[PDB]
Symmetry: C3
Subunit: 183 residues, 3 copies
Amino acid sequence: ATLRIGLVSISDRDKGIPALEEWLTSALTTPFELETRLIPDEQAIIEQTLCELVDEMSCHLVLTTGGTGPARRDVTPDATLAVADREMPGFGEQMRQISLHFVPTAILSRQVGVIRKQALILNLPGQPKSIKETLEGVKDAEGNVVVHGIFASVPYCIQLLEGPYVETAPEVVAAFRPKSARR
Amino acid sequence: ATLRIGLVSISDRDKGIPALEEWLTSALTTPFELETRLIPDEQAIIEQTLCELVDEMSCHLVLTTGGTGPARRDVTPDATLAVADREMPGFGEQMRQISLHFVPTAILSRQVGVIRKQALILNLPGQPKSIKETLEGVKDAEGNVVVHGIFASVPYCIQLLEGPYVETAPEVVAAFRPKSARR
Amino acid sequence: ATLRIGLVSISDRDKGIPALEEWLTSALTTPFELETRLIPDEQAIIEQTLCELVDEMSCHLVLTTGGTGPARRDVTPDATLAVADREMPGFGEQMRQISLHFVPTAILSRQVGVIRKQALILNLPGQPKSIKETLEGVKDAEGNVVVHGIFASVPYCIQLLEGPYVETAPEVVAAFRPKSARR
C-alpha cells in the first residue's frame, strides 16, 4: 500500500521540508504520499499539527524537523510527548548516538520518538545535513555501514504497528526485518 | 547466601523460562533458587506477578522475557514501571546498546530495569539467543570482552541493595566490583 | 563575563569539592566564581541547596558530586529532577556511555542533567577520578580525543541559555560550537 507520511518543519522564525522530500524520494522504493506543514515554534500549534496529521489525515509516520535543543523556545519534544500514547526510548537515545559520531553537541538535543494511535512520530534536527545523517547513518569509504541510520528500523516498526509494507533502496538504507516479517 | 530469582515468561499466545534456567546455571557459582511463572501478555496479570514475586516470594532479582516491542499488545515495560519504586535508566539504555551490536532493530525495544523494594527487575527479549546475548555481551574470537553483558553489573547491584553475595564464572561473565565491595 | 558555578558535594557521611575546583581551574580560560556547598545525603536538603544556588545565588552552572547509585540512600538524581523545569536526556545517557569506557558498573548510576530557570545542573560521580573522566573524556596515548568529555558541550549549552561566553583550554577540553555561535 501507499505510506502516508506527515512532514512538519518547526520554524522559530525553509530547508526542512525540502530536505525530507529529497531524502524520502531517494530512499523509498514502495509508494508514499506527503502531508507537509510549516509552522511556528509555539507548543500548542505543534501539538495541534501532530494531532491533525495523525488523527484527521491518518498518517502512518510523522517526521518533524527543528526545535529540539536546550533553549527556552525549543518545545518540539515537549509537544510530541504531550500528544503521545507511548514513548519509544530507543529512538531518542540512538538518534543522539548516531549524531555524536559527527559532533559532541548532539547530546544537547531533547528529541524523542513516540507512538500516537498506530503512527510513529520522530523528532529530527533542523539542519538539512543533520536530517540526512540521522536517517541514513555512518558508512565507510567503500559504502559499508558502520552505524545504521534510524530509518533502518522504521519499515519494520510500521509493520508491527499494522501499517503498510514499506521497502527501501539498499544503496541508501537497508530495511532490517526478521525472518517472521519478510515477504 | 542463596540468591532467590524470579523468572517470568510473558506469552502473547515456551522457550523463555528454559533459556534463563540454562544461562543462570552456567553463569552463577554461588547458590540460587528459582520461582518461575508463565503468563499471558495482559498488563494487570504482569503487574500482579511481579508484585507476587517481589513481595510475597521475596525474590532478590526478577528477569522477564517477552513483550517489550512497539506493538499495541507489548506491555511488559509498562507493567514493570507501574510496580517500580525507582527506575535505573542505565539498564534500558545499555541493554539496547548491547543488542544494537547484533541488529539495528534493537532500538524498537522499550525494556527497562527498575527497583521494587530491594529487588532488581530487568526486562529481557523474548528470543532465547537474544536473552543470552544481552546477559553475556559481545566477545571476540579468543573470548576477550568487547562490550560487557548486562549481568556483569548485577552481582554488585544486588550487594548495594543489601542482598546476598553473588559470584559468577569468569569464563561466562566476570562480576565487576570495586575494592570496597570485594570479599 | 564571569561564569558563576555552584559545586555541591553530597555526603552520606571531602574530596568532591576539591576535585571540581582543580579541574575547573585547569580547564577554563575565561573567568569564573565558585559557590561551594557540602551537605548530607537527604533529599530535601539537596533540593533546597540546588534552589538556593540557582535562584538566590544566580549560578549559571551547578555540578553535583555523589549519591547517584541504586542504593536506597542515593537520592541526588531524585532531588535534581524535583527542582527541574526541563530534563536534558542526552547528558545522563552520555555520562553513562563515557563512564562505561572505564567500568561496566557505570550503568548503575542514575545521574541526570536538567535545566532550572536558565541554569544547567549536572550530576557527577562521587570519586575524584570519575569526576575528571566524565568531564574530559577518553583520549589516546598521543592525546587525541576518542570520546569527547561531557564538558565539551557545556560552553555552547550555557550560551544557548543566554549565559556568559565561556572558553576552555584545548589541551584539557575543546569547547565545540557551530559557526553561528563562534566569536
